Design an enzyme around this catalytic site. Sequence first.
Site, PDB file in Angstrom:
ATOM      1  N   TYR A   1       2.793 -37.097  15.078  1.00  0.00           N
ATOM      2  CA  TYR A   1       2.413 -35.886  14.362  1.00  0.00           C
ATOM      3  C   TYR A   1       3.663 -35.152  13.892  1.00  0.00           C
ATOM      4  O   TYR A   1       4.536 -34.815  14.699  1.00  0.00           O
ATOM      5  CB  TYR A   1       1.566 -34.984  15.259  1.00  0.00           C
TER       6      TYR A   1
ATOM      7  N   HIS B   1      -1.359 -44.776  21.736  1.00  0.00           N
ATOM      8  CA  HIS B   1      -1.843 -44.207  20.481  1.00  0.00           C
ATOM      9  C   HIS B   1      -2.310 -45.327  19.557  1.00  0.00           C
ATOM     10  O   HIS B   1      -1.494 -46.105  19.051  1.00  0.00           O
ATOM     11  CB  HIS B   1      -0.745 -43.376  19.823  1.00  0.00           C
TER      12      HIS B   1
HETATM   13  N1  NAD Z   1      -7.243 -38.298  13.536  1.00  0.00           N
HETATM   14  C1  NAD Z   1      -6.552 -39.224  14.343  1.00  0.00           C
HETATM   15  O1  NAD Z   1      -6.043 -40.227  13.832  1.00  0.00           O
HETATM   16  C2  NAD Z   1      -6.405 -39.028  15.922  1.00  0.00           C
HETATM   17  C3  NAD Z   1      -6.289 -40.124  16.810  1.00  0.00           C
HETATM   18  C4  NAD Z   1      -6.158 -39.953  18.214  1.00  0.00           C
HETATM   19  C5  NAD Z   1      -6.144 -38.646  18.718  1.00  0.00           C
HETATM   20  N2  NAD Z   1      -6.255 -37.549  17.885  1.00  0.00           N
HETATM   21  C6  NAD Z   1      -6.222 -36.007  18.602  1.00  0.00           C
HETATM   22  O2  NAD Z   1      -7.397 -35.392  18.282  1.00  0.00           O
HETATM   23  C7  NAD Z   1      -7.171 -34.033  17.760  1.00  0.00           C
HETATM   24  C8  NAD Z   1      -8.264 -33.515  16.729  1.00  0.00           C
HETATM   25  O3  NAD Z   1      -8.209 -34.214  15.584  1.00  0.00           O
HETATM   26  P1  NAD Z   1      -8.707 -33.523  13.910  1.00  0.00           P
HETATM   27  O4  NAD Z   1      -7.768 -32.369  13.803  1.00  0.00           O
HETATM   28  O5  NAD Z   1      -8.405 -34.695  13.034  1.00  0.00           O
HETATM   29  O6  NAD Z   1     -10.284 -33.034  13.957  1.00  0.00           O
HETATM   30  P2  NAD Z   1     -11.359 -32.624  12.637  1.00  0.00           P
HETATM   31  O7  NAD Z   1     -10.686 -33.020  11.372  1.00  0.00           O
HETATM   32  O8  NAD Z   1     -12.776 -33.016  12.852  1.00  0.00           O
HETATM   33  O9  NAD Z   1     -11.398 -30.813  12.491  1.00  0.00           O
HETATM   34  C9  NAD Z   1     -10.265 -30.073  12.706  1.00  0.00           C
HETATM   35  C10 NAD Z   1      -9.449 -29.848  11.352  1.00  0.00           C
HETATM   36  O10 NAD Z   1     -10.116 -28.998  10.378  1.00  0.00           O
HETATM   37  C11 NAD Z   1      -9.536 -27.725  10.271  1.00  0.00           C
HETATM   38  N3  NAD Z   1     -10.335 -26.713  11.160  1.00  0.00           N
HETATM   39  C12 NAD Z   1     -10.127 -26.428  12.551  1.00  0.00           C
HETATM   40  N4  NAD Z   1     -10.997 -25.496  13.017  1.00  0.00           N
HETATM   41  C13 NAD Z   1     -11.834 -25.118  11.934  1.00  0.00           C
HETATM   42  C14 NAD Z   1     -12.944 -24.175  11.801  1.00  0.00           C
HETATM   43  N5  NAD Z   1     -13.426 -23.387  12.864  1.00  0.00           N
HETATM   44  N6  NAD Z   1     -13.547 -24.062  10.555  1.00  0.00           N
HETATM   45  C15 NAD Z   1     -13.063 -24.846   9.507  1.00  0.00           C
HETATM   46  N7  NAD Z   1     -12.045 -25.741   9.540  1.00  0.00           N
HETATM   47  C16 NAD Z   1     -11.424 -25.874  10.780  1.00  0.00           C
HETATM   48  C17 NAD Z   1      -8.042 -27.986  10.750  1.00  0.00           C
HETATM   49  O11 NAD Z   1      -7.249 -28.343   9.672  1.00  0.00           O
HETATM   50  C18 NAD Z   1      -8.097 -29.243  11.717  1.00  0.00           C
HETATM   51  O12 NAD Z   1      -7.089 -30.202  11.527  1.00  0.00           O
HETATM   52  C19 NAD Z   1      -5.849 -34.096  17.038  1.00  0.00           C
HETATM   53  O13 NAD Z   1      -5.324 -32.811  16.981  1.00  0.00           O
HETATM   54  C20 NAD Z   1      -5.081 -35.090  17.988  1.00  0.00           C
HETATM   55  O14 NAD Z   1      -4.490 -34.385  19.018  1.00  0.00           O
HETATM   56  C21 NAD Z   1      -6.381 -37.721  16.517  1.00  0.00           C
END
Ligand code: NAD
Length: 316
Positions: free
Chosen positions: A57, A122
Amino acid sequence: NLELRPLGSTGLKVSCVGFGASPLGRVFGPVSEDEAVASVREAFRLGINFFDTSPYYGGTLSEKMLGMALKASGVPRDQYVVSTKCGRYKEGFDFSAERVTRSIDESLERLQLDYVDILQCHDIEFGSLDQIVNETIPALLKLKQTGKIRFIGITGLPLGIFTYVLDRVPPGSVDVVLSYCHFSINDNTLEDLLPYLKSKGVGIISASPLAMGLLTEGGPPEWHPAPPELKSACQDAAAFCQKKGKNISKLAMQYSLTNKDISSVLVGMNSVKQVGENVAAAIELVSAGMDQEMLSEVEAILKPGKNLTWPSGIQQ
Ligand SMILES: NC(=O)c1ccc[n+]([C@@H]2O[C@H](COP(=O)([O-])OP(=O)(O)OC[C@H]3O[C@@H](n4cnc5c(N)ncnc54)[C@H](O)[C@@H]3O)[C@@H](O)[C@H]2O)c1
């Protein structure tokens, strides 16, 4: 008032809403530094005790901002849970025993921490799963002896990587599982895996409650790899929520917290508003319940894209 949930057999209790530090690693300098300290301070203020990051990240920047924010928090270290990852970096993938041994030291330096509670592989679907079973996990077990890590995890998109690895490792080798994009309104296939994981005492952590933007009014990003049938179903359901003057992001976040066999749902947060929005949605779920009429109508619109995934990883 935020609810804490047991994390498998770790003995840890994590907040049902987890702080994903993925968006903290953007730009650089005083701006993002004071936003990182501000959001983490808000997270602690609202009851969040679970923080997840990765050297991928921000190209190791998110780890730096999170460590500075956690240091500026003044919260005792043993009162929150820190998770970082290894094997995936901005330069590529390397799940070797040598790489993951150096990574924990590099991560702890950037995080300014003496230990992480969980160190997770990861996206193992980009490596050889036999290497994960025979080399990477045995290596992390040795790091667990050094005290630099306390619990071991594996992460990735396809649910099959969890059954494959956990079938072939000695019992107790893996302590935590991190899945994403498989417990939201459009996809709840993680439910099938819960009885398997609980049978082995493995903690269950879900992520991407909005399917990485599919369940937002703004829409999915241009790089999103979802099939067009899922993206069309999700955008029509978001407009349906927009016409009725509601927020599909709130409903999607509340839905992801309805199964307390998932210890925590990680959601990306880089602003104080985002932290308070998700924490209040979690609190509102417990105190007022969920809009069953809205959920039933959104779930019907998402039927064409129900449980639809996409390819992820390499080939084995
Ligand atoms: N995506 C991957 O490849 C991956 C893989 C392994 C682990 N992870 C872990 O999982 C965690 C969560 O992943 P995500 O961020 O992709 O989830 P997601 O996209 O379903 O929703 C969260 C995203 O939308 C926005 N958001 C947050 N709160 C909101 C609200 N109340 N209303 C509107 N928009 C909002 C933010 O930009 C955030 O990044 C990551 O932070 C990481 O630590 C991710």
